Amino acid sequence: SDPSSINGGIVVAMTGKDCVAIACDLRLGSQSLGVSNKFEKIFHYGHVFLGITGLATDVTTLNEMFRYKTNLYKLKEERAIEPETFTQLVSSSLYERRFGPYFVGPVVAGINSKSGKPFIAGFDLIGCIDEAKDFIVSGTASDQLFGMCESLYEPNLEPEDLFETISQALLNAADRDALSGWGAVVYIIKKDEVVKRYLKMRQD
Amino acid sequence: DRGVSTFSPEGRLFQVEYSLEAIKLGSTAIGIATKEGVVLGVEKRATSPLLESDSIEKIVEIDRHIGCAMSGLTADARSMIEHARTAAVTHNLYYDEDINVESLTQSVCDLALRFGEGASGEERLMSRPFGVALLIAGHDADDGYQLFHAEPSGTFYRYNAKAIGSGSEGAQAELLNEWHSSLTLKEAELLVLKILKQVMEEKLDENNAQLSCITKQDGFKIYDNEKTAELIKELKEKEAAE
Amino acid sequence: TGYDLSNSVFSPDGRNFQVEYAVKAVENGTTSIGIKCNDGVVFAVEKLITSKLLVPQKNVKIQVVDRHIGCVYSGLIPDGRHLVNRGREEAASFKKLYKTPIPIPAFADRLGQYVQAHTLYNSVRPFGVSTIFGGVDKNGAHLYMLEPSGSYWGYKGAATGKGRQSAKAELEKLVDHHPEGLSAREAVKQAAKIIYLAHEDNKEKDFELEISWCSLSETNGLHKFVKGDLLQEAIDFAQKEIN
Amino acid sequence: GYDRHITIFSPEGRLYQVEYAFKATNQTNINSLAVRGKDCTVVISQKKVPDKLLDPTTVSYIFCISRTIGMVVNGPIPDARNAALRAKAEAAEFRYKYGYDMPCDVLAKRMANLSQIYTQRAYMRPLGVILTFVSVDEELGPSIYKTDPAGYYVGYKATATGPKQQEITTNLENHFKKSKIDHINEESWEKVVEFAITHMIDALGTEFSKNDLEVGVATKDKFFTLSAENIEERLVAIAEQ
Amino acid sequence: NNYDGDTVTFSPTGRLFQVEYALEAIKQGSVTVGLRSNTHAVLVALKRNADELSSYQKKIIKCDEHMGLSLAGLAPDARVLSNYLRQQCNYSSLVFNRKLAVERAGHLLCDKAQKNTQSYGGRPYGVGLLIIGYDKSGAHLLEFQPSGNVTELYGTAIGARSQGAKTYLERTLDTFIKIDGNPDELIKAGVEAISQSLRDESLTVDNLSIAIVGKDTPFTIYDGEAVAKYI
Amino acid sequence: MTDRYSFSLTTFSPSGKLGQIDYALTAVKQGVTSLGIKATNGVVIATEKKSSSPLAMSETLSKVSLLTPDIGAVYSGMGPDYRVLVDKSRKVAHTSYKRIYGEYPPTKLLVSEVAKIMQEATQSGGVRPFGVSLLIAGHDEFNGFSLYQVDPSGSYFPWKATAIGKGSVAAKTFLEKRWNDELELEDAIHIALLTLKESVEGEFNGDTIELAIIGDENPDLLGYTGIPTDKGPRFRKLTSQEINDRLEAL
Amino acid sequence: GSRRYDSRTTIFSPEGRLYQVEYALESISHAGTAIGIMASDGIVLAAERKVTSTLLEQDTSTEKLYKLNDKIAVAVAGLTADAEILINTARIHAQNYLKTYNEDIPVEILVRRLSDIKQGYTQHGGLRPFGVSFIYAGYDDRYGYQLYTSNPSGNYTGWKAISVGANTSAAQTLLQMDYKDDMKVDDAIELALKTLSKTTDSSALTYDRLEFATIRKGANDGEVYQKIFKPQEIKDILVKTGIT
Amino acid sequence: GYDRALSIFSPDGHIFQVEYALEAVKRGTCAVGVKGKNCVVLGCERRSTLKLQDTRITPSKVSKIDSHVVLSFSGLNADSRILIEKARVEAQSHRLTLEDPVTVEYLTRYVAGVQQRYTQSGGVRPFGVSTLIAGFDPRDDEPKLYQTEPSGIYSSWSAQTIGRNSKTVREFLEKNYDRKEPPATVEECVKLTVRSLLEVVQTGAKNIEITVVKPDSDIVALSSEEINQYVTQIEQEKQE
C-alpha cells in the first residue's frame, strides 16, 4: 500500500500582489469508497494558514499537534507567531520523528505583519523547506498542478483576479484525478481580512 | 536521632527491642497444641457498644492446614498474611503438596529483617521492623501438629503452648502448670477458654472471645459464636460444680 | 571543633581529622618491611601468634597480585584484603586490554585513586591500612608504600606498623653500607634480622616469620615464597645476631 | 551553625568550607615559580625529599598533562594526583571530539568549571590544590593560567605559589617596572632558566643544590623536564657570572 | 559515646565502636566448641531453649555434603551468611565441578563482611561461626569474627564463658589432634571440652547437638536420641 | 554509599524568610559595582575589572559576555558562579529555543529561562543558591531595547537603568537625577562614565574599565558580506582604545 | 553520613500541624495584596505591585497577573520565582487537556491539578513547599463564573470575593461589608479599588502601583474576552472612580 | 530518592508519627454516620467561621467513590483528595478484572492498605485523615458502615463519629441508638443524625449538610429547605 494514496487530496497556494490564497478539495476516501465530503484540510492559527495532505489520521494528529505548540507560544511572547518563524517549526517537528515519519506534506501561507511581504512554503514527508515566489503544490495529483499552475500564473494579480486563477488550477486537476473532487474551499488572505469561498464543481 | 540499624553498647539493635514492647500492647492470644489438633483463642475486646464485634479479625485462614492468630499492631499484620498466603499457595503450585508449618514460618520471618537504609535500595522496604507477632498453628504429614511463635526478632521457636499479648506473663505462668499430654480435644478447648477468662477485663461471653481449631480431617475451622456459647455454658457449670 | 565527627570536612588547620585517626589504626597493627634489592624485592611480615591453637604457617598474611606483585599490609586485615581484592581486578583488566603485564608504577596509581576516592565523599570510611607493594617489570625493581591519605612514593626501603621507628633506622644502615646494592641473596638474611630486632617492642608473644621475594635473577621475574632451607638459613642468621 | 561543615552561604555571605581550603594548600613549604620567555615558558619548583629512604626521582610535582601543557601543582600530593588524572583525560577527550590539540586556555577553563561543581553540591569537598598550567600555545604564544579551589582563574605574566610567595611576588614586580615589557626578553631559553633561578636565590635568601630543584620548559612542539645534569649545567653557568 | 553513631567514623584513637559492639553480641549467645584432627572434624554445640514448653533452637547448619557451620548469637544473621555460602558451594560445583575448598570459603566471608561495614546504611553482622569441612587438602576448622578476620585453628570456642573450654583445649592440644582414625574418641574429647564452660544446665539428651564430617563421612548432624552414646 | 542528599538545604524559617536566599544577597552587595542605562537607541552596561595583582592580566578575564549575537550580560558577586551560568544560558538558548524555532530568543524570553535555572538551584536537593545578580541587556524586534535584572531567588524585573554592588545606593540616586527619556546613545554613555567614577577609587582608564553596548546594527562583523537578509550582531564591545577617547571628551 | 544535616521537614509536630506549611503562609502575608471580586457577568483582578521606583520600567512589567489559556487567569501572592514553575505546568496541562478532548478545560480540573502538585510536595521528598497562593479566576460553560484559592497546604475553596497577601483580615472585613449579589462588573471595579485605597501602605494610591484585569462575558458573540488593562487604561479608570 | 526513616518506634512501643496523625483528625470538622433499618446517613459539619464563600462550588466533604459507595473524611483536607482518587481508580480496576462491582468491604480494605503502607515507607509521612465509608453491597439491601484510621486499622460500626469534639456526640449516640432494633424509617434515621450533630454545632442549621445513601444506587443530598424542616421540628421536641 501507498501510505499517501489511501486518502488523497490536493492543496495549492499562490502569491499575488500583497495577498495569498490557499485552496484545496474536500474529499476523504478509503481507497475506492468515498466516505465523507465535509473533511477540511486547511486550518488557521492566528493569521497563518496551514494545509496538510496525506494519511488522513496524521492530518488530524498533526493539526492538534501544531495548535498545542502555537498556543503555548502565544502565551509566552504575547503575539501570534509569524509565518517566517512558523516554517522552521513545522520542519523541526517533522524531522523530530525522522524514522517512521508522519506521511504528510504541509503547506504554509500567510502575510508577515511587520513587513507586509506575502509568504508561502512547502514541505515533504521527512521535512525539507521548498521556498517559492510563485506557487506551492502538494498532494497525489501534484504532478498535474505543477503543469497546470505554471501555464496560468502571471506574477502580481489583484486579490479578485488571483481568485480566478487558483480556481481553474484546482478545478481542472481534480476532475483529471481519481482521488479528488466533491467541492473545494479557497481562502483569500489579505492583511485586514480573510474571505472563504466554497466552489460548485462536479460530483463525478 | 539514633540510627535505625545502630547497635547499642549492650550489643543489641535499638529498634528491635522497642518493637518487642509494642507486642505487649496488643490484645491477648493463646494457643494449646495437643495430639488431636491445636486450639487458638483470642480476646477480641469490644471497644464500645456500637462496635460490631464481629468484624474484629484476629484469626485468619492461611490455607487448608494452617491457622493463624495474631496479636500486637494488627495493622502491620495485613502485610504478613498477604505474603504467607502467597508463599503457601506458591509451594502448592510448584510442588503439588502442602508445606510443613516449620517451612512456612521461615518465609514469614524473612520479611521481618528487611528493615533499613540499604546501600543502593535492594529488597528493603521498611523504615522500621514489624510490630506484630503471629501464632501459626497447622498440621503436616510428617510431624503431626505444630505451633510456632513468629517474633519480630526474626526468630521462631516451636512451643507446646504460648500466651502472647497484654496478659502474657500471668497466663504463661498458668499454662506452665496445667499442660500435659492427657488433654483430649474437649479438655483442651475448655482449658484455653478458662485461662482467657482470668486475664479478660470484661466478662466472658461470645461477643468478645473467639475459639478455633485445626484438625487433620476437617481442616481449619473457625468456630461460630453459637458453638462457643455451648462451651461458655459448660465452663460455668463445671467451675460451680465444686 | 566538631570537624572530626564526619569525613572530608576541612578544619581551620587544614588537617582532615578523620584521616589522621586512620594513621593511628595503622600504627596499632603488626610490623612489616620491604627491602629493595639490587635486582628484586624482599618482603617480611611479623605474624603475632595469639594462641597455641593457631595452626603454624596456614594464616599467611602476604598476598600476591597478578603473578609479579607482592602486597603486605599492616593495620586492619579486612580493610586490606578488600584493597588487594580490588587491586586484582584492576590488574586483570589491564592485561586484558593491552595484553601485557601491568607496569608496577602504573599499578600504584590505580590503587591510589581508589583509596583517595574514600576521602572525597563523606559517607564512606577512610581505609585503615598502609600497604607496601612492588615487584619487577620491564624497568626493574620498584618498592612503594601507600598511606590512608592516598600519598605514595618510591622507597629504597619502607616499613610500617608498631615497630616502624626501629626499622626505619635499621633499614637506613643497610643503604649507607651498600650504595653498590644489597644483592638479592644477601637481603633474605638481612630481612629476618631486621624483623627480629623490631620485634623487641612486641616481645610479649612469640611470632612467626614469613618472607617472600620477587627477583629477576632468582625466580625469573615471578613471585614465590621463600621456604624450606633458605627460610631456615635466614631464621638461623637472625637468632645469631640477637644472641 | 552547620555552615562550617558543608558549603552553604554562611550568615555573613562567606563559604567557610572554601576559605578553609586555601589554608590547607600552603603547607608543603614548596615554592613555585613560572615566568615567560620569548618563545618558551620556564617553571622551576623546589623539591624537598625529607628522608634518605625516599627515592629522589619519584618525588615530583610537575606533571605532563598532554604533549604541550605541563602542570605544576602546589598542595598535598594525593589531591594533585586526583587533579592530574582528570586533566589528562580531558586533553585526550578534546583531541578526540574536535581534532586539534587542547589549547591551554580551554583546559584551564574546563578545570575551573569542574572546581565550581564541588562548591555547589553539598557532598564533595573542594580540592585542596592550586594548579598552574604552562604552555606555548599555538595562537597566543607563551601562556600561564593559575587556578584556585574556589573556581577562580586568571592569566598571568608570572606567578609564585607557596608560603613564602610574598618575597617572589615583589621581586617580579620590580623587574617588570624596570624593563617595561610583559615577558623576560632573553632570546634563548637557557638564559630564561638562568633568570628564573637567580630570582629564586634572591627571594628565598638560600642557594640551591641540584637535588633541590625540578625544572620544566615548554617550547613549541614539546614540553619536557630537565635532568639532574642539565640542571647542574645551569647552576654552574650562574656561578661563573 | 559520640562516634558510635555510624560505622563511617573512626574514633580519636582508631577504634570502631560499631564493630566492637557487634562483637558483644556473641558473648550473649550460647557456648559452642569446635575441634578437629587430621581425619575428622567435630562440633559440639549447646542448644538453648526458652521456657519449658519451648523447644531448643538448632545451632548447627548443614551447608553442603562436605561443609557446615554452627552459629552463636543472632540467628537471623546466621541464616543470611549461610544462604550466601550455599550459593557459593553450588556455584563452584556447577562451573568447575569442584568441591569448594575451605580455605577459599573463609576469604569470601572476609570480603563480604568488609563491604557491609564500610557502606553508609549497612550494619555489622552480629554472629560468630565455626566452619568445619573436608576438602582435597584435608580437614579444617575456621573461626569467623564480625570484624572480618578468618582464622584457622585446631580448636576453639565462642559464646558465654567460652574461656573455660578455650583453656582446656590448649592443654590437651597434643592428645586430641593425634586421635586419628577413631571418630568416637574425638567426640568424647569435645564433650569434655564443653563441660568446662557449663556452669549449671547439665547436659541432656535433648540439649546437646553434635556434627562430624571427615574423610569417610558426609556431613551428618546428631540430634535427639542419637546423642545418647556420647553422654 | 547511599547518598542521602535529597532534602533541600534551604528551608522556610519561623520568620517567613528563605534563609539561604537572604544571605546570598549579602554576598551580592559585596561584589563590585556594575550599572546599566537604557536609552532610545541602545543600552550600555559597564563595570570595573578588579585586577588583583599587577602580574595578573584582567584582559583574559571577562565580566561581560556574549550570550547570543544580540544579548549581553554583566554581573555582581561570585566569579565562578557567574561563569557556569553563562554556559548554561548559551547552551539553553540553542538546544531549547534556537533549533526548534530557527531564531535567537527574544530578550524577555531568555531571561525567563535563566530565571528557571536559579529556581532549580534553590528548590532541588543538595544545592545552594547562586551568589550572583545578572543584568541582561538585549534587543529584539517587537519590544525594542530592553534591560533586565535577575536575582539569585529567581525573580527578574525590567529596569530603565540600575546599579548593583558596593556603591549601588550612591549610584542609583545619581542615575535618577541625570536620567531622562530623550537620552541618545552618546549621552547615556557619558552618564555611565560619570556614575562609575564615583564608585571607583583606584585606576580609572581604558585598561581597567569594561564597557559594552547593545546598539545599532553592525554589518562589519557580519563576516559573510553579500546577503541582504542578514544584519549581523547588535552587540559590540568597546575596546581599550575607544574607552580612553570618551575620557578626553569628558 | 548525611543523617545529621536532614531538616526532616515533612514530619508532623506534636500538635498535629505541619511546620513548613504554617511558615509558608506567614511568608505569603508579606507579598503585596491581591483581591478578586466576582460579579454576575465577569471577574475583576486587582493586585497591588511591590517594588516601585521612578526608575523602574512599569509598562512592559508583569509580576502578579498571568494568563493561563484563553479563558482563565490567575493572580500570584508570594515568591514570584516559585510561582513561575507552577504557572508553566498549568499551561502545559491545559493544552494537553485540549489535545485529548477538544474542549477548553473546565475550571474545576485545572485547579484540582495544581493543588495535587502542591500537596505532593509536603507528602514526601523532603523539599520545602512552594510559597505561593493563587486566585484562579476562570470561566467555563458548566457553571459560569468561578473563583478559587489554594494555599501551600493544597486545600482549595471557592469564593465570591477573597483577599490574599497583606491585611487579609482588614481587606476581608471591608469586602463582607460592601459585597452584594446583584453587582455588575462596573460596580465591582469600583469596590476593588475602594478596598485597595484603604489597605494600601502607600500615602496615596496611584496608577503606576496597580495591576488590573477583567474577564467579561461582554465582547462580541458569546465568547469571553480576557483583558489585562494597559497601564494607560488604569489611569483612566482611576479618574473615572474619582479616587484621584 | 529520599530515604530517611520518618517512622521509627520509640522506647515505649508507639510510633510517634501515628499518634500525631490522630491529632490532625481532632482539628478537622465533624463527620458522623448513623445506619438504620435499610439506609445509611452521612452528616458533615461545615465551618461558619469562613463566610462569603460560594456554596455552590465549595468541594463537599461527601464524595462518591462509585455509583453506590460514599466516603466522607475528617482531618487534613489536602491529604484526603489523594485517598479519594486512588479509591475511585481501584473501584473501576476491580470492575475490569472481576466483572462485578466492589463489595463495600473490598473498597475499605484497599483504602486502609494505602494508609498502612505510608507508615513504613522511608521518605513519606503518614496521612492525617480518618474516613467513614458507607454503602450497599451489590445485589443486597443491608447497610454497611466502616471506619478507617491513619494507622491502618479498620472495623465495622453501627454509628460512629470522628472529627472535632467527637466524644460528646459519641456519648449522645451510646445511649440513644437502640442496637437490637435499628431506627425505623429513613426520615427517623435522618432525624437522629441531625439531633446528634446539633449537640456540637454551636448554633447552625445551614452548617449541617446531609447526604443519604439508599439501596439500588440511590444517593441524594438533601436540599437546604429539607434540612431546615427537620431542625424546626427538633426545636419543638426540646421545649418542655
Which 8-state DSSP code applies to residue E217? Answer: -
The domain containing residue B209 runs over which residues?
1-242
Q: Which of residues 20-39 of H touch G (CB under 8 A)?
A: 20-27
CATH at residue B205: 3.60.20.10
Residue C131 falls in the annotated catalytic set: no
The domain containing residue C232 runs over which residues?
1-243
Instruction: Please report, for residues A87, F217, F219, the alpha-carbon distance to residue F227 in angstroms, rounded to integers and kept in the order given.
Output: 21, 15, 10
Beta carbons within 10 angstroms of residue C23's beta carbon:
18
Tally of domains in chain C: 1
Q: What is the DSSP string of chain A?
A: --TTTTT--EEEEEE-SS-EEEEEE--EEETTEEEES----EEEETTEEEE--BSHHHHHHHHHHHHHHHHHHHHHHSSPPPHHHHHHHHHHHHHTT-SS---B--EEEEE-TTT--EEEEE--SS---EE-SSEEEEETTHHHHHHHHHHH--S---HHHHHHHHHHHHHHHHHT-SS--S-EEEEEE-SS-EEEEE------
CA atoms within 13 A on the CB side of A180: 28
Q: Which residues are bridge partners to H162 per DSSP?
A: H31
Query: Of the candidates B7, B157, B179, which has its C-beta nearest E22's C-beta?
Result: B7
CA atoms within 13 A on the CB side of G34: 25
Look at D123 and C121 and tell me if their CB atoms are within 8 Å: yes
- Alpha helices (H) in chain E, listed in sequence order: 17-28, 75-95, 102-118, 163-171, 173-176, 183-195
Q: What is the DSSP string of A188-202?
A: EE-SS-EEEEE----
**How far does chain F reach from its first CA to its final CA, in angstroms?**
63
The answer to whether the CB of C47 falls within 8 A of the CB of C32 is: no
Question: D163: Cβ–Cβ under 8 A, 6 or more apart, which residues?
Answer: D26, D27, D29, D31
Q: Mutual orientation of helices F168-178 and F185-199 as an angle, nearest 10°?
A: 150
Q: Of G92, G112, G108, which Cα lies nearest the Cα of G100?
A: G92
- H or E stretch including B137? strand B132-140
Look at A88 and F106 and tell me if their CB atoms are within 8 Å: no
Which of chain D's residues have a Cβ under 8 Å away from the Cβ of G2?
122-123
Q: Is residue A67 within 8 angstroms of chain G, CB to CB?
A: yes
Which of these is catalytic: C1, C30, C100, C131?
C30
Look at G5 and D122 and tell me if their CB atoms are within 8 Å: yes
Q: What is the DSSP string of C42-111?
A: EEEEEEE---SSBPTT-S---EEETTTEEEEEEE-HHHHHHHHHHHHHHHHHHHHHSSSPPPHHHHHHHH
The answer to whether the CB of A134 falls within 8 A of the CB of A15 is: yes
Is the C-alpha dihedral spanning C4, C10, C15, C16 positive or negative? positive
Q: What is the DSSP string of G53-113?
A: -TTB--SS--SSEEE-SSSEEEEEEE-HHHHHHHHHHHHHHHHHHHHHHSSPPPHHHHHHH
Q: Which three cell numbers stand for residue F50?
A: 578588579
CATH at residue A102: 3.60.20.10
Q: Is residue F225 within 8 angstroms of chain H, CB to CB?
A: no
Give the distance from residue C113's alpha carbon to the nearest chain E alpha carbon, in angstroms.
17
The answer to whether the CB of D47 falls within 8 A of the CB of D212 is: yes
Q: Of G144, G165, G176, which Cα lies nearest the Cα of G45?
A: G165
Q: Of G55, C76, F5, C38, which Cα lies nearest the Cα of D123?
A: F5
Q: Which residues are bridge partners to C38 per DSSP?
A: none
Distance of alpha carbon H53 from alpha carbon G195, whole angstroms: 18
Distance of alpha carbon G196 from alpha carbon C48, whole angstroms: 87
The answer to whether the CB of G129 falls within 8 A of the CB of G20 is: yes
The answer to whether the CB of B145 falls within 8 A of the CB of B34 is: yes
The answer to whether the CB of G175 falls within 8 A of the CB of G37 is: yes
CATH at residue E17: 3.60.20.10
Give the distance from residue F207's alpha carbon to the nearest chain H alpha carbon, in angstroms.
51
Which of chain F's residues have a Cβ under 8 Å away from the Cβ of C121?
1, 3
Q: Of C39, C29, C202, C13, which Cα lies nearest the Cα of C134?
A: C39
Q: Residue F214: helix, strand or coil by DSSP? A: strand
Distance of alpha carbon G181 from alpha carbon G190, whole angstroms: 15
CATH of domain D1-241: 3.60.20.10
Tell me how the structure was determined. Answer: cryo-EM
Tally helices (H) and strands (E) across chain F.
Answer: 6, 11
Q: Which residues in chain D belong to E strands, given as ranges? A: 32-36, 40-46, 62-64, 69-74, 130-136, 142-147, 153-156, 158-161, 213-219, 222-225
Distance of alpha carbon H123 from alpha carbon G123, whole angstroms: 9
Is the C-alpha dihedral spanning D14, D17, D22, D24 positive or negative? positive
Distance of alpha carbon H73 from alpha carbon H78, whole angstroms: 11
Instruction: Please report, for residues B153, E115, F58, H15, the alpha-carbon distance to residue E25 in angstroms, rounded to integers and kept in the order given.
Output: 14, 20, 65, 26
Distance of alpha carbon E44 from alpha carbon E59, whole angstroms: 10
The answer to whether the CB of D158 falls within 8 A of the CB of F162 is: no
Q: Which three cell numbers stand for residue H23?
A: 491529632
Q: Which three cell numbers stand for residue C66?
A: 597478578
Tally helices (H) and strands (E) across chain E.
Answer: 6, 10
Residue spans per domain, chain H? 1-240
Q: Of A75, A10, A97, A12, which Cα lies nearest the Cα of A49?
A: A12
Q: Of F65, F19, F35, which Cα lies nearest the Cα of F178?
A: F35
Tally of domains in chain E: 1
Backbone angles phi, psi at C220, to 5 degrees: 70, 30
CATH 3.60.20.10 fits F1-249, yes or no: yes
Q: Describe the strand order of the beta sheet including F132-140 as a list of residue ranges.
A: F64-68, F71-77, F132-140, F144-150, F156-158
Question: F194: Cβ–Cβ under 8 A, 6 or more apart, which residues?
Answer: F174, F178
Q: Which of residues 116-135 of C touch E (CB under 8 A)?
A: 122-126, 128
Which of chain D's residues have a Cβ under 8 Å away from the Cβ of G126?
none
| Residue with grid cell 629493595, as numbered in its chain | C36
Q: Which three cell numbers stand for residue H165?
A: 469534639
Q: Which CATH architecture has domain H1-240?
A: 4-Layer Sandwich (3.60)
Q: Of D75, G63, D161, which Cα lies nearest the Cα of C16?
A: D75
Beta carbons within 10 angstroms of residue G198's beta carbon:
11
Distance of alpha carbon H93 from alpha carbon H78, whole angstroms: 24
Classify residue A166 as left (phi > 0), alpha (psi -120 to 50) or beta.
alpha
Q: Residue C17: helix, strand or coil by DSSP? A: helix
The answer to whether the CB of F102 falls within 8 A of the CB of A88 is: yes
- H or E stretch including E209? strand E208-214
| Residue with grid cell 481519481, as numbered in its chain | A178
Q: What is the CA radius of gyration of chain A?
A: 16
The residue count of chain B comes to 242
Q: Describe the strand order of the beta sheet including F161-164 as a list of residue ranges.
A: F161-164, F34-38, F43-48, F209-214, F235-237
Distance of alpha carbon H58 from alpha carbon H51, whole angstroms: 12
Q: Which three cell numbers stand for residue H194?
A: 441531625
The answer to whether the CB of C144 falls within 8 A of the CB of C155 is: yes
Q: Which residues are bridge partners to E188 per DSSP?
A: none
Which 8-state DSSP code applies to residue H9? Answer: B
Look at G1 and C5 and tell me if their CB atoms are within 8 Å: no
Q: Please name the amino acid found at residue B53.
A: S
Q: Of B176, B187, B242, which Cα lies nearest the Cα of B213?
A: B187
Give the distance from residue H197's alpha carbon to the nearest chain B alpha carbon, in angstroms.
17
Which of the four CATH numbers 3.40.50.300, 3.20.20.140, 2.60.40.10, 3.60.20.10 does domain G1-244 have? 3.60.20.10
Q: Is H56 exposed, middle or buried (0-12, 13-18, 19+ CB in 10 A)?
A: exposed
Count of A–F CB contacts within 8 Å? 24
Distance of alpha carbon C183 from alpha carbon C38, whole angstroms: 5
Q: Of F3, D119, D4, D126, which Cα lies nearest the Cα of C123?
A: F3
Which of chain F's residues have a Cβ under 8 Å away from the Cβ of D157?
55-57
Distance of alpha carbon H7 from alpha carbon B131, whole angstroms: 12
CA atoms within 13 A on the CB side of B86: 8
Distance of alpha carbon C153 from alpha carbon C110, whole angstroms: 14
Q: Please name the amino acid found at residue B205.
A: D
Q: Is B201 exposed, middle or buried (0-12, 13-18, 19+ CB in 10 A)?
A: exposed
Strands G161-164 and G210-216, by their bridges, are unpaired
| Residue with grid cell 585606576, as numbered in its chain | F203
Strands H62-66 and H40-45, by their bridges, are unpaired
Distance of alpha carbon C189 from alpha carbon C44, whole angstroms: 11
Instruction: Please report, for residues A51, B129, H7, the alpha-carbon distance to residue B4 in angstroms, rounded to integers and kept in the order given.
Output: 65, 9, 10
Tally of domains in chain A: 1
Q: Which three cell numbers stand for residue C120?
A: 572525597
| Residue with grid cell 629477576, as numbered in its chain | C216
Which 8-state DSSP code applies to residue B108? Answer: H
Distance of alpha carbon F83 from alpha carbon D152, whole angstroms: 10
**Could you tell me which chain F residue has the CA closest to the CA of D8?**
F128
- H or E stretch including B158? strand B156-158
CA angle A123, A124, A126 (to 5 degrees): 115
Q: Is H128 exposed, middle or buried (0-12, 13-18, 19+ CB in 10 A)?
A: buried
Is the C-alpha dihedral spanning H225, H228, H232, H237 positive or negative? positive
Q: Please name the amino acid found at residue C158.
A: A
Give the distance from residue D154's alpha carbon to the nearest chain F alpha carbon, in angstroms.
6
Q: Which three cell numbers stand for residue A144?
A: 498535474
